[PDB]
Every structure is written in structure tokens, then in C-alpha cells.
């Protein structure tokens, strides 16, 4: 189990390594979706309107 | 995480050590035979059973080899063992007959499941209280099918006939199918009980009883050597529309699974040549089952050629699952095909690629798939492939239950609720049968959300964990109470909410805690 | 007369409908439809249109089929429901300009006022602008060739009025708006090179070929002005533009200062919290 | 001998340094996924809006 | 007495035609028709959609001219549009998208032929441009009041039908009334064509035209905007001089809703235009 710990840990290494491109995709895409929704709720606001008090 | 290019040869050259010893070991030969799946590997040990002249040691290996972990390998080894011997002479005959039987296990299982039954009135009373005539009507009978499975008790449904046939709908079909779930492993009393209902004019007003009887028959005779299929062909030859085509495709398709016959393939083709979506979907579901391991050359191009030429979604998803389930051991083969079909315009086929690569890469042997899985999950705007994303992920990562909730922790609360739903299914299938609390402690934020989808998925995920677990070791009291509050909160909740609720409650009460699930 | 025109995506989507309802004929030749718009205002505006059957002959190219009755009926009903739009001209989906098109347009040149011709492609593999507005007028030729109908290129733009933008944006959910920033600008700064590359490569090759290897005097005279435009930039040594480069690089320095200073301001809260929050959380942890 | 308790030992300790690098990968993934959850929380907030 | 799950297929054709019908959605009552082909019972597809001339009578069964209808339909038959009418659509501006007595009566009269009779009501007037999402309508039978209301399977799409979440009209008019789900369809041709056309709509003809314009406008126009940007940034900085005092006093809780960060970040994003167009000018000068 001592020498097996290495070979067993390699799987965890690859598993933790594969998450890099994943979080890259998330952080790059969700900000684009963020500005998307931002402009979506921004275009809701229009100049012509009624003035209250 | 081997690529199988070496390990198979390593094992097959490592199985020569114990045969030279004083006694053989069952564990290593089983673990190897379920891996390399080589017909020549079992070739010596099958013929050594006669040489060793020992009956008791052969029973174990025969039973556990014929129990699972193969289909066509078993179909090959049964005729291979049939060839060996006469076409202790008298002992070898009864031995070779009894080892491939397999009915004994079904008998003892059905028996102990018949005598272990323990039921409570509170649950069924609650179901009869929370029942509706539209939505959860199917949930009640599927819950009944869950709890009454294996005990073959129709006495619960013998209470009243006005709780079933009072209205004409698919609910009666799901009820008959539920009855098919209740009793299983009957070569006589099944068809007998099905024909005992209305053997008068042989013309029932509801065909859902006949079609549901065919589907139930397919459920019962599935994976058996007592197949009525020969009669099922002529029974499918009958003149009808909805039930014969659909129910027949489902039943006969499930009964013919593993046979890999070209006849059922042909009749399935002439069944899907009517361009209809429903019977073609059933045709897809059946084809995926019967063509497993066969891998026909022109089948793929024929189906993908039949894909984009129809606008119906049902035939699309039907062929999707059809080409998804048919793919096994293609890890070193179908990579180019999946990569080519990944860029397709069709969302259904895009999900079909993931469902196809799902079972093919199972066993965590490929780290390449999850790249484009997560990529198409995050990048693509359509919630279809996003909710179809992490299912394959859970399928390939099913080996380690602990690592899943960590990487799906970000998908716990997502942007679109569909991703939360798929992630709920992921936590449901990955943590199923295990004791992992990483999902459990995260179930609390999941049980309450403005969206009903993620809530229902959380109910299912919570249903797939607490099953077969001791209460004294872990504090499940909270989630048990919040699950038991779902039935009293049904009035203040959504119509589908109570549906998924009682459906989640039907999981734990299924089989009376006796039967469980294992990946 | 008309400086620029406005072409709405609706008509091209109607061409998509033309490629829709085909139903696997095995002919799929050029189809001439009838474009509708407002010729009242100086700038042309396209709202909607309809479709009329158009067929030709394999061998003889002089064969063209139109319908007066169907046209008068469709335009009649369309004028009945909407009086804010009238007839303007026609269009074809043919990638190439046939010689018979002058005779096809001659009809609407007689019955109707001057018509504008629009040329598009059957397969949207073209990266450039699919719609080219061509006005039909008679111009005096310098070489002395007999007066004939000449198609002059008119600039155009693709836009929508109000709801069509919403419909498109909803049906797509893919394309992004202007969105001033890094990626939106750098994407253009990347692909534009290819936008010029494929176009120029598709042009100058056939140009070089047809100039030396070809005939039918299309009046090459304008191409001397082309080459002249190519000679308008005789490899400037930038020696006079050095000061301009200095000012531009100075503005770049301004961008540097602004960026550095602002980021230095933003770093405040981060390089405070990273300490004060962590030390407090750690000391209050146990 | 002087290998398994020496060479394999320093190999396992090299693997521990690898565990340190993967610890950097670990907490980088942690703060990145926390920022991810933050941006997702704000996106869910404007979604509620 | 059999009922299945139906789903209405909507293409870009009918959508855009209902947008033009939205421009035609003036308070004057209008009429419309929808055409298509029925392959089976539980699916419905619409393709050909046109408008109808306005009248002073408004929407009524008498308003529809049968001979003119059959005439136009025949004119569609001689052409490449061989589809039967799948129903009719209209607009109900300002009083709500619901159906009145006359409307449900002429609906009852027009559903005598087709059992489906898809009903679509578009009202862009009070509808924000943020969402073009529309809800199709259906007509329940009057003899089903004894049994259950809607015997429809596939209940998973009701959450997608939950888009009209208004707390008044839905369960208010829910009696003898209901709706149906809506989905779209898109192929590669429409996708590529519309995407390229829209990208070109946001782009130029030769695409090299208006770029160099702004590139050379960076030294004229943008400069003033940069000066104003520095003015606002300084207007923030004068408060940022007051901030370290508060940071030296309280540090507990945030009483200032102003982020002061992301805005300046966006200012930097607008400042990066010079850097991005610098390489552009380099490419223009070089070759
Ligand atoms: Zn009104």
C-alpha cells in the first residue's frame, strides 16, 4: 500500500488536472453570459416614460 | 486507469500460475474473465471441470459466471458447453443441464421475497389521500409497483375496480405495466392472470390492457430462456394500431435483448418504415436492446440517414437512445464517430453522442470525454445538452462516489435550473447505494428553490441515497421529516411537486426495504 | 437619385422559405420574386414581399416566365390591407447575372417605374454582404457603344425597425451585440484579415485571368482608375508621419498611466481585505 | 539494501512535493470556484431581477 | 374520449409575420390566418401565415369572406403552398390577451372543421422588447366539466408553460380555459444564413471601412471622452481621499452601495480601444 499510494494518487492528480480547462470554460463563458444578461436588463430601460412623484 | 492494451495480456499471462498450484482460486479467474472477456480464457477451465471430478466447486463458478458481467459471452459459452459432452455420463448431463438453468435463483429469490414482506397501512392510506385523477395517478400505481414488486400480490389492487378503470387514459396502461412490475418470473400464471380478466368476447374496449399485457410479458420474460417470442411474432402479426406496434416493440424488443437476431431487426425496420414517431421511438428503444454487441455496419448510417429526414422529436430521441445503448466496448473504435457526430446541428443527436459515449467510456478509462462534456455543458446555450451533460459524467465517474460531489458542487446552484436538475440526477446516480454524506449535507440548500424542477430532482437524489441506511449512524431525521412534509405541503406546492414527492417516497418503500440497487 | 437603400432580413428569410418549400424538385434554378417597398421617400425601405412562379429553359436563355394576373392580384390585396407600401422592383437568387435579365426587368420598366435589382447566393457560403442593390439606369458610354441598360452598384445596410430585432435576438440566442471591450473588438481585429483575404483572393485571381485571357469589352477603362487607386499610395516612408506616430504612442502612454493608476486604485480593497479578513477569521476561528 | 527506505523514500517525498504543487492546484481551484460561485450568485441575482 | 399531448411548432416565418402583424397591431381589430399540414394527431406545424384587411365591424365570423378566403387559398394551391388552414390568429391590444364572447363564439364556429384550431394572440403594445415570448391558446370542451379538466401527459413542460406567471388572469380565467406549450425548430441553412446576415448587419460591407475611421478618430473624438473619463475618475478619487479615514474608523459593514471598482474597470475596457486599434494602424501602415 506504500508503493501503491503513488499509482493510486496519479488518478487523483489527473482528476484534479482535468478541472483546469473546465473552470477556464466556466469563468470565460459565464462573464459573457453576465454581460449578456446585463445588457438584457439594460435594454429593458427606455427613455420614453411617465414621470411620477 | 489502464488503456487495456497491456492489462489484458498481463492477466491472461498471469492466469497460468494458479493452475500449476495445488488448488485453483475463483476470485482471480472471475476478476480476469469479467475483464478480458476472452472465450479462450474460459476454454480450459470449462473442460477442467470434468477432469477435476468435483461438483461442489463447479457450482460456484458456474453460478457467478452465468449470473452477470456478460451477455453474448454467456450466449457463446452456453452452446460451447452444450457442444462439450454427449449430444460419469449421467452426472455430467444433469450438471450441464442445471448449471445453465438459472431458474433456481429466481425461484429462491421469489420465495424469500414472498415470505419477507412487511407492509404498513399509513403509507398506502397517505397515497390514497394524496391521489389525483390526472397527474399523480400514475405516481400512485408506480409506487404500488415499487412496493409490491417481487411479492406478486394483486390483493392490494383487488380492493376496488373503480380506482383504475374509472377513466380512459394512459394511466390504465401504466397500471397494467405496474401489475407487470408486481409479479415477475411466471411462465404460466402471468399470461393466465392476464387472460383471466376478460376471456368472453375477446374484444376489450380498452386496448391498453392488451398492449400493457404485452409490455408486462416483456418485463417478465426478459433475460430468460423460456421466451415466448416465437408466439410473440404471430401475436404481433395481429391487426391493430397503437398497442401492437408500440407495446409489441417494447415487449418483444425487451424479450429479444441479447439474441442479436436479424429477423427482429428486419421486422423492427418494417415497423419503423411507417414514419410514425411513437412506434419508431419504441422501435429505437427495442433496437438498442436487441442490437447490443452486434454492431452492424450499415445500421448506423441507416439510422443517422433516417435522423435528419424527419421533424418528429420522438423518433429522434428514439433513435438517439437506440444508437446510445447499442454502443459497448467501442472505446477504441467509435471515437471518430462520436467526434464526428458531436458537431451535428441536432440538439437531440448532440445529447445522443453523450449518451452513446456514456456507457462506452464507463469504468473511468477515458479522461478525454469529460473535456468536451464540460465544454459543451458550459459553452452551449441550449439547456438540453446541459441537462444531458453530467449524466455521462456520473456514469464514467461512478467508480468513485467521493470525487463527484466536489466537481458538481459548482453545478449545485447553476444559472439555468436545467443544469441543477441534471446535477441533481448526477448526485442521485453517483451517490446511489453509497454512504457518502457529501451530497447529503448539500441536500438542504437543494430541497428549497423557487424552481420546481431542481426541487423534484433534489427529491429524487434524496430518494436514491437514504435507501438501505441505518438511522443511528447518521442524522437523517431532518431530511426524513422534510420528505414527510412533502405530502402535507402538496396543497401549497405545485402539481408536479407532489408527483415527484410521492414518486421519491415510493423509492424507499419499494420492496419493503428488501430490494435495493447497485451500480 | 437614391444614395442608399435599406434591406430588411425578412425578404432574405423569404428566400430561405424559397429554399424551404422546394420539396426536392431536382431543378432548383433561379427564382424571380417581387420585392415591395416605399419609393416615395428618397431612401428605400423594404417591409415585406410575396413570391411568383418563375421558370426558364435549359438550352435557350431568352425564355422567361412571369404572371401579370397573379401580380395584380397579390399587389391588389396587399395594397388593400396595407396602403403604406407599393411596388418597387424584383430580385433573383441566381449567383450569376444572365443576359435575359434586361428583358425580364424591361417589363417592370414599362408597367412600373424604375426597378432595383438584387443579387444573392443560393448557398450562404459567402462571408461578404449577400445583398447587392443595383439600380437600373441608362448612362452615356465613353467608348461610344450603343446605349443599353446598365446596372450600377448602390450601397446598402441590413437593419430592422422595432420588433424584428427582438424576434431575431430571441430566435438566435447566439450572436452578441456591440459590447465594447476586449473579446468583441479582438475578434474583429482577428477575423477581418481573413474577411479581406478570402475576398481579395477570390477577386484578383479571376481579375488577372479575365483581363489578359478574355474578351467582350466590358469597358476596362475604370480598372485603370482601379490601378490608379492602387498607385495612390507609393510606399510612404512615414518620415512625415513620425510626429503622428509620436502622438499616437503618447496616447498609448496615457493609456498606460490610466491603466496602471486605476488598477492601483482597485488593488486597495483587495490588498486590505486579503489581510484584515483572513487574520480576523483565523483569530476568531478557534 | 538502502533503497526502499532511501530512494523510494525520497521518491515518495518527491511525490509529497508533487502533492504540494497539486495543493497549489487545489486551492487555486478553490478560490477560482469560489469566485465562480460568486459570479454565479450575482448572475442568479440579476436572474431573480 | 381519448386525449394526447400536443405541442405547437412555431417557425421564424409565422413569428416574423406576427411581428409585421405586431406593427399591424393597432387598436383597430384585425384578422389573420395560419396554414400548415397535419402529419398526425399530437403534432401541429404552421408554415404559411398572412394578414387580412381591416374593417369597421372588427373581429367577427361575418367579417371573414368565404369566397375571398377560398379564392386566396386556391391561389395558394396553384402555387407552391399546398397547405390547409390550421386555424386563425388575431390581436387584442390593451384590454389583455384573453378572449371575449364574440371571439370564443367565432372560435367555436371556426373549430367546427378542425378539431385542433390553434389560437394565437399577439399583443406587442404592452409587451416589452426584452421578450417576444408568446403563449398559444386552446379550447376545452364543455362536456368535460364532469371529469377532469386536462387529461394531458408529459407534465414536465408545464414549468415551461409557467411563463405566464401573472397572479390574476391565469387562475382567474382558468375556468373552462387553458393553454398549450410552444417550441421552435431550426435547421443548418436558416442558422448559417441568419447568423451570417446578422453578423454582417453588425459589420460593414468591406469591413475595413469604418474601422480605420475610428482608428483615426482616437486622436480627436475619443480623446475628449478620455478627458471626461479622467474627470469622473477624479470625481471618484476625491471621495477616495475620504475613504481611508472611514477605513481607519469603522471597517464593519458597507453603507456605500457604490462599488467604485467595476465602473473604473469598464473605463479601462474603453481605454483598451487605443491599444487594440494600435496594431490595426500598424497593419494599415505596414501593408
Ligand atoms: Zn377590444
From Swiss-Prot, chain A:
It comes from the Eukaryota. Coiled coil: none annotated. Disulfide bonds: none annotated. It is found in: Cytoplasm; Nucleus. Belongs to the AAA ATPase family. Component of the 19S proteasome regulatory particle complex. The 26S proteasome consists of a 20S core particle (CP) and two 19S regulatory subunits (RP). The regulatory particle is made of a lid composed of 9 subunits, a base containing 6 ATPases including PSMC4 and few additional components. Interacts with NR1I3. Interacts with PAAF1. Interacts with TRIM5. Interacts with ZFAND1. Component of the 26S proteasome, a multiprotein complex involved in the ATP-dependent degradation of ubiquitinated proteins. This complex plays a key role in the maintenance of protein homeostasis by removing misfolded or damaged proteins, which could impair cellular functions, and by removing proteins whose functions are no longer required. Therefore, the proteasome participates in numerous cellular processes, including cell cycle progression, apoptosis, or DNA damage repair. This is 26S proteasome regulatory subunit 6B. It comes from Homo sapiens.
Curated annotation (Swiss-Prot), chain B:
The gene is PSMD1. This is 26S proteasome non-ATPase regulatory subunit 1. GO terms for biological process: proteasome-mediated ubiquitin-dependent protein catabolic process; regulation of protein catabolic process. Disulfide bonds: none annotated. Keywords: Acetylation, Phosphoprotein, Proteasome, Repeat. Belongs to the proteasome subunit S1 family. The modification Phosphothreonine is found at residue 86. One of its GO terms (cellular component) is proteasome regulatory particle. The keyword Transcription regulation does not apply. Component of the 26S proteasome, a multiprotein complex involved in the ATP-dependent degradation of ubiquitinated proteins. This complex plays a key role in the maintenance of protein homeostasis by removing misfolded or damaged proteins, which could impair cellular functions, and by removing proteins whose functions are no longer required. Therefore, the proteasome participates in numerous cellular processes, including cell cycle progression, apoptosis, or DNA damage repair. GO terms for molecular function: enzyme regulator activity; ubiquitin protein ligase binding. PC repeats lie at residues 174-207, 212-245, 247-281, 282-316, 318-351, 352-387, 388-420, 422-456, 457-497, 500-519. The keyword Transport does not apply. The chain holds residues 188 to 748 of 953 of the full protein. The modification N6-acetyllysine is found at residue 491.
UniProtKB/Swiss-Prot annotation, chain C:
GO terms for molecular function: protein homodimerization activity. One of its GO terms (biological process) is proteasome-mediated ubiquitin-dependent protein catabolic process. Keywords: Acetylation, Isopeptide bond, Proteasome, Ubl conjugation. Gene3D superfamilies: Cytidine Deaminase, domain 2. Pfam families: JAB, MitMem_reg. Residues 5-140 form the MPN domain. InterPro entries: EIF3F/CSN6-like_C, JAMM/MPN+_dom, MPN, MPN_RPN7_8. GO terms for cellular component: cytosol; extracellular exosome; extracellular region; ficolin-1-rich granule lumen; membrane; nucleoplasm; nucleus; proteasome complex. There is a cross-link at residue 176 (Glycyl lysine isopeptide (Lys-Gly) (interchain with G-Cter in ubiquitin)). The modification N6-acetyllysine is found at residues 200, 210. Disulfide bonds: none annotated. Belongs to the peptidase M67A family. Component of the 19S proteasome regulatory particle complex. The 26S proteasome consists of a 20S core particle (CP) and two 19S regulatory subunits (RP). The regulatory particle is made of a lid composed of 9 subunits including PSMD7, a base containing 6 ATPases and few additional components. Within the complex, PSMD7 interacts with subunit PSMD4 through their respective MPN domain. Interacts with TRIM5. Does not bind a metal ion. This is 26S proteasome non-ATPase regulatory subunit 7. It comes from Homo sapiens (Human).
Curated annotation (Swiss-Prot), chain D:
It is found in: Cytoplasm; Nucleus. It comes from the Eukaryota. Component of the 26S proteasome, a multiprotein complex involved in the ATP-dependent degradation of ubiquitinated proteins. This complex plays a key role in the maintenance of protein homeostasis by removing misfolded or damaged proteins, which could impair cellular functions, and by removing proteins whose functions are no longer required. Therefore, the proteasome participates in numerous cellular processes, including cell cycle progression, apoptosis, or DNA damage repair. Belongs to the AAA ATPase family. Component of the 19S proteasome regulatory particle complex. The 26S proteasome consists of a 20S core particle (CP) and two 19S regulatory subunits (RP). The regulatory particle is made of a lid composed of 9 subunits, a base containing 6 ATPases including PSMC5 and few additional components. Component of a complex with USP49 and RUVBL1. Interacts with PRPF19. Interacts with TRIM5. Interacts with NDC80. Interacts with PAAF1. Interacts, in vitro, with the thyroid hormone receptor (in a thyroid hormone T3-dependent manner) and with retinoid X receptor (RXR). Interacts with ERCC6. This is 26S proteasome regulatory subunit 8.
